[PDB]
Amino acid sequence: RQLWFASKQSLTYLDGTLPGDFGFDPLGLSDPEGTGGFIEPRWLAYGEIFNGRTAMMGVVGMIAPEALGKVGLVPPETAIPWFQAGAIPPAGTYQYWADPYTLFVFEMALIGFAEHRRLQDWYNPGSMGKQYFLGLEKYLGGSGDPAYPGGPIFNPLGFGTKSEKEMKELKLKEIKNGRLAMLAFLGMSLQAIFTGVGPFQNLLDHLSDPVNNNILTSLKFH
Amino acid sequence: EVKIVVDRDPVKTSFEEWARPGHFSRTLAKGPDTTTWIWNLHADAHDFDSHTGDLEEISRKVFSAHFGQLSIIFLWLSGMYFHGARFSNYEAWLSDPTHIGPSAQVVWPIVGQEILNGDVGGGFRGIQITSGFFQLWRASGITSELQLYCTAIGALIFAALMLFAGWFHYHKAAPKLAWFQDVESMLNHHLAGLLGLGSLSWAGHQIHVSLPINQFLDAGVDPKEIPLPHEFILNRDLLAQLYPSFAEGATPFFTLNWSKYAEFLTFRGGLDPVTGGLWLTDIAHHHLAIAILFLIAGHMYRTNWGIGHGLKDILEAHKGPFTGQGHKGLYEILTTSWHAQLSLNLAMLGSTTIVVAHHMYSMPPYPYLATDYGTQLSLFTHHMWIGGFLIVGAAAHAAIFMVRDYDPTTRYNDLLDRVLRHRDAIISHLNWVCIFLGFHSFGLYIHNDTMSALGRPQDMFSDTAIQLQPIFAQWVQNIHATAPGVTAPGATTSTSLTWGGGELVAVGGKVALLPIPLGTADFLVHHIHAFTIHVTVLILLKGVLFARSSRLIPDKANLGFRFPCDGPGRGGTCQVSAWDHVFLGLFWMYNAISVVIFHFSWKMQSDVWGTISDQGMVTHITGGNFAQSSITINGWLRDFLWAQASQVIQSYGSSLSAYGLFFLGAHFVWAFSLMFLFSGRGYWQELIESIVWAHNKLKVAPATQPRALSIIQGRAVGVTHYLLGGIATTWAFFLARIIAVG
Amino acid sequence: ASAPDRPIWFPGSTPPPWLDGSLPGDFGFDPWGLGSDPESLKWNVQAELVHCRWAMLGAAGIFIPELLTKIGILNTPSWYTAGEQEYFTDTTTLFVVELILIGWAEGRRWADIIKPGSVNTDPIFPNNKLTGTDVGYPGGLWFDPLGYGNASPEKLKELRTKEIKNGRLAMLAVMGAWFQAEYTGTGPIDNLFAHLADPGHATIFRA
Amino acid sequence: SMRDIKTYLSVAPVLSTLWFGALAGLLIEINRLFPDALSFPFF
Ligand code: CHL
Numbered sequence A: 001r002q003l004w005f006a007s008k009q010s011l012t013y014l015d016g017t018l019p020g021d022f023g024f025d026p027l028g029l030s031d032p033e034g035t036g037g038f039i040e041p042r043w044l045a046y047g048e049i050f051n052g053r054t055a056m057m058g059v060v061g062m063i064a065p066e067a068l069g070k071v072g073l074v075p076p077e078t079a080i081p082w083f084q085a086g087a088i089p090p091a092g093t094y095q096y097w098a099d100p101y102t103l104f105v106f107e108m109a110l111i112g113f114a115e116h117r118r119l120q121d122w123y124n125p126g127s128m129g130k131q132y133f134l135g136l137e138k139y140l141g142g143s144g145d146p147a148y149p150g151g152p153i154f155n156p157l158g159f160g161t162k163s164e165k166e167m168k169e170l171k172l173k174e175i176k177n178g179r180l181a182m183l184a185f186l187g188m189s190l191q192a193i194f195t196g197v198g199p200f201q202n203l204l205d206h207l208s209d210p211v212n213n214n215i216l217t218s219l220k221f222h
Numbered sequence B: 001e002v003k004i005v006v007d008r009d010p011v012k013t014s015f016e017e018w019a020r021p022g023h024f025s026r027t028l029a030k031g032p033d034t035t036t037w038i039w040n041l042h043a044d045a046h047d048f049d050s051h052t053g054d055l056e057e058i059s060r061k062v063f064s065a066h067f068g069q070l071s072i073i074f075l076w077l078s079g080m081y082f083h084g085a086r087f088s089n090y091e092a093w094l095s096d097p098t099h100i101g102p103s104a105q106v107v108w109p110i111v112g113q114e115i116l117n118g119d120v121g122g123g124f125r126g127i128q129i130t131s132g133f134f135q136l137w138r139a140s141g142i143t144s145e146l147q148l149y150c151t152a153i154g155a156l157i158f159a160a161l162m163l164f165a166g167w168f169h170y171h172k173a174a175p176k177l178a179w180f181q182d183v184e185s186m187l188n189h190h191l192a193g194l195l196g197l198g199s200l201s202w203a204g205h206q207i208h209v210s211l212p213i214n215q216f217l218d219a220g221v222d223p224k225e226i227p228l229p230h231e232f233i234l235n236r237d238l239l240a241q242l243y244p245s246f247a248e249g250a251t252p253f254f255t256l257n258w259s260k261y262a263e264f265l266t267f268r269g270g271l272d273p274v275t276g277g278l279w280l281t282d283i284a285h286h287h288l289a290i291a292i293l294f295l296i297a298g299h300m301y302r303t304n305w306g307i308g309h310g311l312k313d314i315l316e317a318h319k320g321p322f323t324g325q326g327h328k329g330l331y332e333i334l335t336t337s338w339h340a341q342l343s344l345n346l347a348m349l350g351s352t353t354i355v356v357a358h359h360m361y362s363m364p365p366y367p368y369l370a371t372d373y374g375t376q377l378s379l380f381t382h383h384m385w386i387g388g389f390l391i392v393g394a395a396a397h398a399a400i401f402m403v404r405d406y407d408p409t410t411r412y413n414d415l416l417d418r419v420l421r422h423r424d425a426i427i428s429h430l431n432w433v434c435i436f437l438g439f440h441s442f443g444l445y446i447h448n449d450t451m452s453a454l455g456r457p458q459d460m461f462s463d464t465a466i467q468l469q470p471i472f473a474q475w476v477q478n479i480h481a482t483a484p485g486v487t488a489p490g491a492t493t494s495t496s497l498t499w500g501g502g503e504l505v506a507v508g509g510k511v512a513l514l515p516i517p518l519g520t521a522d523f524l525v526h527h528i529h530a531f532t533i534h535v536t537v538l539i540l541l542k543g544v545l546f547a548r549s550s551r552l553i554p555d556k557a558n559l560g561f562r563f564p565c566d567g568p569g570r571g572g573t574c575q576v577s578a579w580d581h582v583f584l585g586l587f588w589m590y591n592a593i594s595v596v597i598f599h600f601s602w603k604m605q606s607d608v609w610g611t612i613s614d615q616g617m618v619t620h621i622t623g624g625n626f627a628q629s630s631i632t633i634n635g636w637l638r639d640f641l642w643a644q645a646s647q648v649i650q651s652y653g654s655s656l657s658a659y660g661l662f663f664l665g666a667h668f669v670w671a672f673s674l675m676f677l678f679s680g681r682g683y684w685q686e687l688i689e690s691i692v693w694a695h696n697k698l699k700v701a702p703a704t705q706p707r708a709l710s711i712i713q714g715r716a717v718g719v720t721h722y723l724l725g726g727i728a729t730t731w732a733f734f735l736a737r738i739i740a741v742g
Numbered sequence C: 001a002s003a004p005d006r007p008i009w010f011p012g013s014t015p016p017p018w019l020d021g022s023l024p025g026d027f028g029f030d031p032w033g034l035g036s037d038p039e040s041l042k043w044n045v046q047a048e049l050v051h052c053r054w055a056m057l058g059a060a061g062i063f064i065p066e067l068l069t070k071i072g073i074l075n076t077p078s079w080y081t082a083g084e085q086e087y088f089t090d091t092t093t094l095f096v097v098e099l100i101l102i103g104w105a106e107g108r109r110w111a112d113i114i115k116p117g118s119v120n121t122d123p124i125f126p127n128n129k130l131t132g133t134d135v136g137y138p139g140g141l142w143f144d145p146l147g148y149g150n151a152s153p154e155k156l157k158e159l160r161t162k163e164i165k166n167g168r169l170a171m172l173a174v175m176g177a178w179f180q181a182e183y184t185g186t187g188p189i190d191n192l193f194a195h196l197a198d199p200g201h202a203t204i205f206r207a
Numbered sequence D: 001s002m003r004d005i006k007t008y009l010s011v012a013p014v015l016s017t018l019w020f021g022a023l024a025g026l027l028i029e030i031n032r033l034f035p036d037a038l039s040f041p042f043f
């Protein structure tokens, strides 16, 4: 257990009881005294895990269109940098099937169904297995931990069965591969601002000739 | 440690209390027996300290109420921006500022009130404004009504956020007492996070938005053809065509080549000759330097890492050579009493507002502000009044501290004791100096009036007679006017055109500013100001210092902060309470501020404002009559009030008739207050008895028994209506005069 | 007739204590607590049952004529302007006749809400009368000639729920048609064809 | 509750505000329909 910037106050409530516990609270936001609203260890852990899980596929989906286009498997029209796909209108756009805004409502309906349905299990676990839901309510029961739902729907293949310590190791792997993705997202967000070129394209410039480094990219052109 | 600790769900959200008026008070919750109850319900509403003796509950209520005030302020700003976007001639004003009058209020056509929609210009009819919003919006780079709409919508959303935050931080998660008493961390956050970063962000906005937009505006470009604000951001060539230093980016900032940025970071001084305001690059450099100063300041106090000065240690270390450590015990006093903090903060804010009023007329910061005479007069007068009121409130709440929180058995302080032990000497010397100043200032005016009436002008105090020149002020003016070159080699021109150095700036054929000369009349009026201020101090200080006892009432602290008297004995004891000292101080504050604004109005109209011809002949509004006529009382009566009241009294039948109506109505209210001030409540209760007999005769006597106003309420109603009437009378006078003749 | 184990408007939420699935169409939806006091609940039930039938009558007579005109069988004008045309008499003289005739029935219905069962007899001929036995659900040859209103308390509740839901749909449909007519500028049937021609761009954001 | 909100809406300042608003509206509309009257001309 490699403690990192652990303070005297933080060591009291940080005792390696949660996966990926290394003891880094240099501000004390996870202190158990005076809790209310959103600041709460269970909610903070859930939020960290969820932001990381989202950031995983966010970073993965922002690189494939450029590399796969370069290798010669996607038409050049589609293969464009991530920030030129319509999410940022002043930085290029593409003509999709319906609209930049009708797609937003279409997406928001489906995502809001899932989010409003997931929020209930956090409040009272197991409450989604009662009311009729076209026959899928007998599977949307839960496990007892909102962060790790499990079940046939969320685990069709039993990769986390017949062992206990292996589950802890998988949780620790998830924490690392989710913490890496958030920093990757931050990096690819800043790189596009300071360079204006696709992140995958920026890799080759440093890989081939490590001369155009950060100092040469400090003038902050358009 | 410095940790965020709260309590969850302290108060349940319910409508039960809304149906029980007086719920907060154990003596009001019963219900009414007389009409007095009703008045009490409104008088004790926000006096949290009297509701309970628990400090934490008081702090929580204070926090929630402050959130409510912020919500209301945001509503006010949203309304201002929406009315600017929807019912104004701002776009037309953008193309001819000197000839068009700003207007953002229009009225509906009923009962003939549509005459108030006056001809302000630019194909628009409405009411002219003096708040100066148009100049502020022009200085921000705003060129379209859509931007104003967006700002108004944002302000509405912020108001909603503040109200919800008040509800949440009271009824759901209320901070603990230790959270409120972390003064070191609060000071660190409010010095660095609030002021330093706020100034940094505004300086960034000025550098990236305001300057390029105002360049096109002053270059003579149609507003609809100006590039949009975001075009200067995602296209640096457009911004570099005006300031070539944007080609090198931020490299000089980190390589310490800051002199490359001298194009838009200057130290000029003076005024821009086109707009008549301060150079924008000077303002940007100012906000940058101020931001650095506050960011450095906000690292002085210790929170969690064992670095930084402790506030208690500083106070307890200074001590005193007078046989004791004087400043020991102030930290405990200042961390356990809301009233003392309120007193100190009110005094500081009130004085700051007066500073703002003085500085904004002499160094006009907005474009096309100096030649809009009505706006200048309005802003100066407004901030003078606000500052006076805050300063009076400081004395009131210091008295509240002395009565309710002072306790030398638990929290002793040596300096407060030493001050309390020579109060006779302090008060007597202040009394004497007031008498001396009154004689040797007002008696000079009396002597001049007598000499002039007797046909002996050669015996007067005047520039052509016995002279009393203000040599020290003239010397300081001369030092400031010649400062550029020796003591401030890096500045091109002085901070203000009023210092000296003969030079005039004219915009649209109107004078903006020029040197202001000082003579015998200025000497006299300045010593009058000194007199009024020293008297106000005498009254308020007497109120605070003798709050607990005196040679007359040994046990006054047992009677409280606010009580009418202690009986007709001892010769008579009316108005011995501290509240009565505040009541008396409000009158002298009114006197002082009224004289200040009259002096300002006459001096500026006589020696500064006016027109200039092609050859350069300055004609003033009142033609330089201040020097000879302001040295007698008859001169103030004849050449200032009688002469300048003509505009307000001739306004009927035009768009300015509302100001005549308000002039008369305010005289009415002022005279109405005297009925409350001169009489007493026994007479009125006796009269009410007779009226109640008649109502009983016809079976219409109410169960809520009518009663006359209490003695304190009589005094309060009196002073409130006196101040409202006087201030509104002067308001109408000023606005009609300056709008019609300026 | 309490039935806690029934579908609600928001699964996982607790239904209000003043709703227990007795009235037809109950789904435990009353966030603002407008029916917490039992006295106002009956008034709200009657008001909803009246708004529903008015909306159903409006909707059934506002789309079918438009559909027939679009096909070409009938030549009726736009519904959104039929109020401003000219008829055999003055438009103001029709409103007063409508007020008198409808007010007779409205007062006759109002008398039953306050005093149930007190207006069930014909005022002129005291032999004919109505066989209805519940407030808001009358019954007789005038209001139920077929005789579908008399059944066991199994089909009655399902029929009432069917009526309530077919009325709740029409209540939103009528307001939608009004807003579309005011905003789009054409007929309601044309909007359906516009949305079925280009279902990606022909939406509210198009204007 | 509905009982409590109905009780709060019946308090004196709120009821005064509503009553005076309605009366002011009525007088404004009347003066918009029959303006500038100095006498009663109907009979
Ligand atoms: C979504 C962000 C986020 C959140 C909510 C948490 C939350 C947590 N981390 Mg984790 N972390 C997060 C991101 C990261 N952590 C780490 C590295 C660690 C370590 C090494 C450790 C933790 C630990 C903890 C826990 C206790 C510490 C605490 O006070 O938590 C409450 C604290 C917060 C809610 C702070 C939230 C800050 C906010 C996200 C940003 C604030 C502004 C930034 C300073 C600047 C941002 C700029 C933009 C442009 C990126 C807690 C569950 C400790 C533990 O025991 O974990 C099991 C521990 O030892 N975290 C990294 C890698 C650098 C992160 C990267 O994104």
Ligand code: CLA
Residues within 6 Å of the ligand: B062, B063, B066, B067, B070, B179, B180, B182, B185, B186, B189, B190, B192, B193, B194
């Ligand atoms: C850098 C952090 C910061 C900032 C920006 C502020 C800002 C403010 N504080 Mg302070 N405060 C801070 C830290 C901060 N505080 C800390 C750490 C503590 C605990 C020691 C306190 C304790 C405290 C108290 C007890 C009070 C304030 C109050 C105020 C307001 C003073 C009036 C004013 O100038 O309004 C200027 C107005 C604006 C700039 C517009 C509003 C902009 C938003 C709302 C600012 C939100 C700031 C906040 C830190 C956000 C946290 C969000 C998060 C919790 C989710 C102002 C909004 C007073 C007040 O009025 O509270 C309501 C007050 O009574 N603060």
Ligand code: CLA
Residues within 6 Å of the ligand: B042, B043, B044, B045, B046, B047, B048, B389, B390, B392, B393, B394, B396, B397, B400, B562, B579, B582, B720
């Ligand atoms: C930040 C400023 C501030 C704050 C938070 C407070 C807070 C407080 N003050 Mg202090 N005070 C302040 C500024 C402040 N004061 C100033 C500037 C002054 C100098 C004038 C005073 C003078 C003062 C006195 C003399 C007293 C207080 C008292 C109080 C307490 C009760 C107030 C109350 O219930 O009012 C309830 C509010 C009303 C009944 C309504 C007042 C309306 C005013 C008088 C007229 C408004 C007219 C308006 C501008 C025009 C409308 C015209 C139109 C209707 C036609 C409370 C702790 C009282 C106390 O007992 O403290 C312990 C007390 O006696 N204050």
Ligand code: CLA
Residues within 6 Å of the ligand: B431, B432, B434, B435, B436, B437, B438, B439, B442, B443, B446, B535, B538, B539, B584, B587, B588
């Ligand atoms: C115009 C009205 C007026 C006048 C002249 C005064 C005068 C005075 N007030 Mg009063 N006051 C007034 C209105 C007025 N008040 C009102 C309306 C209120 C109610 C709000 C008060 C409330 C009030 C308070 C609460 C206090 C005063 C104080 C004072 C004194 C200030 C000290 C001073 O200047 O001494 C110098 C004297 C004068 C300026 C008077 C004029 C003298 C002339 C110019 C010269 C006379 C020459 C010669 C002697 C003539 C002899 C002739 C022979 C035949 C007899 C002074 C006696 C304060 C005080 O006592 O301070 C020590 C004080 O505390 N006043």
Ligand code: CLA
Residues within 6 Å of the ligand: A108, A109, A110, A111, A112, A113, A116, A117, A120, C007, C008, C009, C010, C011, C012, C027, C029
């Ligand atoms: C009083 C009315 C009412 C309201 C306001 C709600 C509100 C809600 N219900 Mg509830 N519900 C109601 C009645 C109501 N319900 C009734 C009467 C029942 C009994 C049958 C239910 C049964 C029910 C269930 C079973 C569920 C909800 C859920 C929800 C939530 C959905 C949140 C979301 O993001 O939706 C997103 C949707 C929208 C924002 C509306 C989008 C509408 C689009 C534009 C329609 C397009 C139709 C399209 C043309 C059809 C063909 C498409 C094809 C061509 C591709 C929300 C809190 C869900 C939930 O989260 O539960 C926890 C859920 O699972 N409700």
Ligand code: CLA
Residues within 6 Å of the ligand: C172, C173, C175, C176, C177, C179, C180, C183, C184, C190, C191, C192, C194, C195, C202, C203, C204, C205
């Ligand atoms: C159930 C009623 C209903 C139906 C079937 C439709 C259908 C339609 N509307 Mg209309 N609309 C409705 C209600 C309805 N509307 C309501 C209540 C409003 C007022 C808020 C509007 C306001 C409106 C506007 C302003 C416009 C349309 C338009 C349209 C068309 C394109 C879709 C769109 O943009 O929707 C936009 C949707 C809304 C603005 C809000 C809809 C809210 C209701 C409650 C949704 C109900 C969904 C329903 C439960 C799904 C199942 C239905 C069932 C029969 C299968 C489409 C033919 C557009 C058009 O003319 O295209 C040619 C158009 O410009 N509608």
Ligand SMILES: CC1=C[C@H](O)CC(C)(C)[C@H]1/C=C/C(C)=C/C=C/C(C)=C/C=C/C=C(C)/C=C/C=C(C)/C=C/C1=C(C)C[C@H](O)CC1(C)C
Residues within 6 Å of the ligand: A024, A025, A026, A027, A028, A029, A051, A052, A054, A055, A057, A058, A059, A061, A062, A082, A085, A087, A181, A182, A183, A185, A186
């Ligand atoms: C896919 C796609 C597609 C298309 O094309 C486009 C789009 C849409 C754009 C995309 C998407 C994307 C996404 C979704 C993303 C996401 C992201 C995230 C979530 C991030 C985070 C992220 C996150 C992050 C950074 C975070 C961070 C954090 C931090 C630092 C913290 C720190 C700390 C801690 C620990 C604690 C202590 O006491 C304090 C401190 C020291 C302060």
Ligand code: SF4
Residues within 6 Å of the ligand: B564, B565, B566, B567, B568, B572, B573, B574, B575, B711
């Ligand atoms: S006159 Fe009034 S204030 Fe003076 S002692 Fe008598 S009761 Fe008290």
